[PDB]
Amino acid sequence: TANILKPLMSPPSREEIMATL
Amino acid sequence: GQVVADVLCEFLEVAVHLILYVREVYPVGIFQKRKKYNVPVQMSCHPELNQYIQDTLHCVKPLLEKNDVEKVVVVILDKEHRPVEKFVFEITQPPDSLLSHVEQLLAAFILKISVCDAVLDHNPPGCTFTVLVHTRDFPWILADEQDVHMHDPRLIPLKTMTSDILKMQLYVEERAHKGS
DSSP, X not given: XXXXXXXXXXXXXXXXXXXXX | OHHHHHHXXXXXXXXXXXXXXXXXXXXXXXXXXXXXXXXXXXXXXXXXXXXXXXXXXXHHHHHHHTTOEEEEEEEEEOTTSOEEEEEEEEEEOOOOOHHHHHXXXXXXXXXXXXXXXXXXOOOOTTOEEEEEEEEOOOOEEEOOHHHHOOSSEEEEEEEEEEOSSOEXXXXXXXXXXXXX
């Protein structure tokens, strides 16, 4: 609907995080 | 205006972190115990995640200052991009230690988040999140039906407050059939 905004960029994936750990 | 926005951005940051922990959107290993509003919380130590959340809320701030925000929603999405839980903060800024007062009231919301796993079913593996803002470098886009529509929501009230500078209600909508 017309007045709901979201970030265009996504947060880092959990997978992406797990890759660094 | 600015006071309410500052308080709210700071609260929303802690609340988003805590939601991500209690709903297992990220591994428990990246979160550290901390204390906020005099209550125990869990905060991510991962710099990219933290910067994401910060950037998101920095964008929300000027809207709060001008009282243009109806809701801020933390949406948890399954591997298929289906909303499975929504934490909805509906916000209203109404027309001697007001900050200490308001923080003690915000503490109540934190406390209710920290135990909301008692009333929600597990989420499926592999979920992610987004934040939706309902209005009255870090680019925002209009949400699509995909990001919002949730089949068969169950509404679970978490907390409501009223104060001289802020009224706010937090509830969760949980998809009745997450699938697994």
